[PDB]
């Protein structure tokens, strides 16, 4: 019986849970109000504030941090790496604290687990960071030398549902081909070729179909124009990619249930914009089908939007069932996903990756690719 | 946004959770040691003890019981009723407190929700009690007039996975035919005919295949003999049906992972007994296939034992795939299951049943059946 602690720091919340083997024994979401949050200049300044909530969470359990077998955290903005469960080390910490790859609340998670680790000797891990990158070189070329397509998406949910589909039919994730569509506030559509995400859109940076809250890919010219059109507000213009865009920008809401209600009342602009979102998701799924050369076992719809079975799901299904049957796996459980990955490691069913080495192996391969600087 | 509280009292534990719509915000399992538990004569005496833990659980949340939209509890030993979400009323309470249908820790749940209800005005519900009974008359005949086959199983998990399978393929639970096998410490195999469990074994009372901890159906003669063979210990002989039987009685453990480890070491008695359990599950699935006249869309393996994909799952699959394809849906989430059922009701997507009336409609039909007393 292994007792595990999962750490999941988000932009506006902090989720923690305790697992005893595969059974969850405690979980609590600690939301943070804009007020309470704006009290910090840089994101790193929240470090002690959030650690305090975690120590407190275990504290009022009667258990001590040394009674745990592992501490597991959501990855963060680490350098590109293959999927898997990594041991938190010195290089990871240095990178996270220096925000060399950007600052994000999720970076605090690994740091927090590491300290819990230095005080108890218990192992700390991070699994499937948002920077998981397992794509093929051909997918990196963008059309212009000083631009690269990068793999930045909800890799944890992707990998997790893919393995769930396999396990459901007692097959191996490694022997299938899938098109998995994670449709939440962010939308990533990935091509899984034999356990490897060979191509996917850069969801986190706003590339792809538009979402309930993001605008997704936008017209090039019209952009470079409205770019320096005086309307320049590096911030304002920058929030139209991850904050103020998509359904919320057209209908004034990012709640699908609200939008479906309107469609049932005869709202035509609402239905036209919602239908356009499904239309885009379908197109991208088509892109990924072409990536797999048509060899697709299943198309999987997952994420919050997969719950909407009256319009969205049926619309997508009609357009893409010619590629492969459609399977719906609604939602996503980050806590359970992280704890199980740590259990597999503790049970010796999976080998822990070493971020340090693993990062070098990746950069070495990427650097050989990047050697296109030869004129 | 509806805030819901789920109440789940078990034999040795108490699980509570708080949902804000479909998002879980707090959950905690309160295990109770034999010492702390044996401090009460009758099960009803734990009433105030467990209520105190629930009030405390919400207490340290900052929220007040009146800020909730609903209180949801696991059913209990109520009189037979169709599946669904019931409003807790006076008749239910009277029945639970009087243990007329038996005493069980799960009975405390509804009672606790009801009080929370009388203090705040908020609605209290119980969903899919273990006594859900939707079988056909033909399935009730046992072979002897003063004996009836009763439907007592983990109806919540059954109903829940069945609907999940449907939703997965965007079809309606009401338009399919399934054989669902819940394989945990208790094993129920049910025939789902168009959204109605028309037949299933009385898992809770020890009828069916043997389990990791229960003996299941036993030889009649050998039983009636060993019945009054002096070895009579109404208790001891009674615990060989739900406590001391099955794998634990043969191998000395009810942990499948432990048993699989032994099989990998060459243990032959272990492998022979484990294989016999799969063998039995398969036979019962065959019984249910005959109940559906072969019209089966899918065979679904769910519950803890569904996690064991090295032996159990593959053994069952080989024996029954001639009936219909096999789908594996491991585990079971009671908290999420209860909260979602209350959300659907609060959202008006499902109508709440009235235990009082619903119980009469059931007994009336049963009584017409029972009218076989006409010589
Ligand atoms: N039952 C339901 N019916 C219809 N829509 C639902 C739903 N539950 C959630 N949604 C919608 O699906 C969308 C996504 O929820 P999800 O939990 O995946 O998003 P997120 O807020 O966590 C952001 P991201 O996906 O980038 O992490 C929501 O924005 C909501 O509009
Ligand atoms: N990952 C895993 N691999 C193999 N076996 C597992 C497992 N997780 C659980 N099990 C086994 O499956 C069985 C059932 O767990 P489940 O959670 O359904 O049981 P339960 O204890 O809740 C009793 P009941 O099913 O009657 O409520 C356990 O008895 C255990 O031996
Ligand atoms: Na777009
Ligand atoms: Na038996």
Swiss-Prot record, chains A, B:
State a GO cellular component annotated for this protein. cytoplasm
Gene Ontology molecular function: acetate kinase activity; ATP binding; butyrate kinase activity
- TM ranges: none
Catalyzed reactions: butanoate + ATP = butanoyl phosphate + ADP
Q: Give a Pfam family name.
A: Acetate_kinase
Instruction: Give the Enzyme Commission number.
Output: 2.7.2.7
What keywords are annotated for this sequence in UniProt?
Answer: ATP-binding, Cytoplasm, Kinase, Nucleotide-binding, Transferase
GO biological-process terms attached to the record: acetate metabolic process
Q: Where in the cell is it found?
A: Cytoplasm
Can you tell which superkingdom this protein's organism belongs to? Bacteria
Return the similarity comment.
Answer: Belongs to the acetokinase family.
Q: Which HAMAP family match?
A: Butyrate_kinase (MF_00542)
Protein name per its UniProtKB record = Probable butyrate kinase 2
